[PDB]
Structure formats: C-alpha cells, structure tokens
Design a protein around this ligand. Structure first.
Ligand SMILES: Nc1ccc2cc3ccc(N)cc3nc2c1
Lengths: 186, 186
C-alpha cells in the first residue's frame, strides 16, 4: 500500500527517535513518496502523527476486548488492563513522542481538542470497567469519569516511567497499584 | 565557582533555547571559561546537563524539607507533595529542556543509569512519608519501597498526561487520587 506504508514508516521513526527528531524528509527516503503525497491524506505533520495515535489507540482497544474475556469480574478486568498495558505493542510505546509533541504544540489551539477527543478513547476502558462494576455491585463509584481519568493517567505513568527495570518488576508493581487503587474505591 | 558560573550560565541557556539548541561554545564564552575547563568538569554536554538536574533535585529537596513543616501528619504530607508536584511543573523553567533531554537520551544505559539515581531521589520523599507514616500508625505498609515507587510514578503520570485540562480540574483530580490511594492502604 502507500497511504498505509507511510503511516507505518512514521510510527517506527516516531518510536525509535522522537516526534521532532523524525522529519517528513526522513519518512520519505524509507517510504518512497513525493513530499506532496504526504499532503493530501495528511495535512500537517501533527496530522500524520495525530493520525497514528488514533490507529494505535484503536488497535489497542481492540486487542483488549478480544482479551478481557479472560477476566470474569471487572475487578479482574481492571487488574488485567493495567498488566496488559505493560506488554502490548500498541499506543503506549508512543507515550514518549506524545509527551514531546504536546510540548511543541500546546501553544496552538487545534491541540487541546484532538489531544482531548482522543483522551475519551484512552479512558473509555476504565469508564466501562468502572460503570459496569457499579452496575454489578463490585464497588460504588460516584465520580466515574474522575476515577477513570485518574486511573488511566496513573497507569500510563507506571507503564511509562519505569520503562527499563526488568519487565517482571513492572508487572509486580502494576498489580500492587491495581490492588491499592481498588481497595481505595470501596 | 567558575564551575558554578558554568552551571549557572548553562542552566539559563538551557531554559531559553532548550537542550539540543544550546552549544558548549555559548556556555564557554558566556561563562568566560574554556572548552578545556568545561571538559574537565563535565566531559560532555549531556553530563553537564545531568549535573544541573542534580543541583535542581537538591534545591527541590531543600525546598520540600521546608515546605513540609506545613503538613503536620504524613497523610497531609502525601496530599501536599502531590499537589506541589503538579502545580510547580506548570511553571518549571527547565521542564522543556528536560523533556527534550529524556526523549532523546533514554536509550543510552550510562545516561539512563544516572537518571535513575536521580529519579530515586525523588522517590525517597515518598519513601520517607510512608516509613514515617508507619511509625505513627497513620497506615500500615510492609512494602514501603513498592508503594513509594508506585505513588511516584502514578503521580507523575497524573502530572504529565493531563496538561489539556484547566489547572483547577487537575488539582481536583490529583487530590482525589491522593484520597483513593491513601484510602486503599487500610
Ligand atoms: N528530572 C527532573 C530532575 C530534577 C527536577 C527538579 C525539579 C524541581 C522543581 C520542579 N518543579 C520540577 C522539577 N523537576 C525535575 C525533574
């Protein structure tokens, strides 16, 4: 493909290097396409990027759903999303470039929106897990969206700022977190 | 001192033009030193920067040591510390140079090493709060180190990936997170 091979060469660079470090110039040399190509379907560079994120968030949200069946209760679902959060190959590997990208575009306006429309996807899983939990008496959440946002973000943190110490040390902590968090809800 | 003038000057240079942009040449002239002296004190720009970050860390600790008298109980110190982490980052000058530095150096294990020595120092604040909380029976934690690493990274997540929301909502969520987490410890 073309408008899909670019979307893939970019992802690899955005991850390997960073948001800025990777240039549309580069993208082309390893994806063979006139500069203009990147223009029709991808307007700005924060377009091609804000794009990939969508794909990633979707792919991950999908992987989770074809994977949460292994969890009988929501308490189990919560626990599992956070673990899987550490192993996926989706979305999370791009948290870094996201951090950078937001620092180099917070001064514009179209940023706060997209960078908040996608936030609704990001926290969805937690909203479902938490609402359903109320619909199932596992706990009693009055401020679900508050709790869902706090959860999502907290977790992203553990996943993102412990990226190095042996992969199982992470899974350990992550579970202690899911533990403590839930015990604090009810 | 001439070493400190270089640190001083370098810190500012970093604040105004960011990391990747500042050159040791500028640092040399503006601090009235030399390539040689700069080399003897830090070897490289990356180490120079790390040295600054260390100074910053100490200042922060010194500040915390004073700021925490306001919080009588450890439960209180936990709430306050997290609030501070969030509010101060809003106007931290070096923040940008840091984001630029990490998302461009987390690959090297040498610079990824010294970095954890630094992160550990941030984590200690939690460790102290938690250890001291035990000796007053505010809570009963048998895995302080664990909980401490979790809190540090949970909070950091809430700080880094929330920017889009208005400052009050952030402070509001962060306080809720401190409440849930502190509650799930009993
Ligand atoms: N990686 C680092 C190292 C030192 C730091 C020192 C700080 C001091 C005050 C403040 N508000 C934020 C800080 N962030 C740091 C982040």
């Amino acid at each position: 493909n073309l408008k899909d091979k670019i979307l893939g060469v970019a992802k690899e660079l955005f991850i390997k290097n960073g948001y800025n470090a990777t240039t549309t110039g580069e993208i082309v040399k390893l994806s063979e396409s006139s500069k203009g190509n990147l223009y029709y379907h991808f307007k700005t560079k924060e377009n091609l990027f804000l794009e990939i994120l969508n794909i990633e968030e979707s792919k991950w949200q999908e992987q989770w759903k074809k994977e949460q069946i292994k969890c009988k209760t929501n308490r189990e679902k919560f626990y599992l999303y956070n673990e899987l959060s550490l192993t996926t190959e989706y979305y999370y590997p791009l948290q870094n470039a996201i951090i950078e990208f937001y620092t180099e575009y917070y001064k514009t306006n179209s940023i706060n929106e997209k960078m908040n429309k996608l936030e609704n996807k990001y926290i969805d899983a937690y909203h479902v897990i938490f609402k359903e939990g109320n619909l199932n008496g596992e706990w009693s959440i009055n401020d679900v969206n508050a709790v869902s946002k706090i959860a999502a973000n907290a977790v992203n943190g553990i996943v993102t700022f412990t990226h190095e110490q042996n992969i199982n040390e992470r899974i350990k902590l992550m579970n202690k977190f899911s533990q403590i968090f839930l015990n604090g809800l009810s």
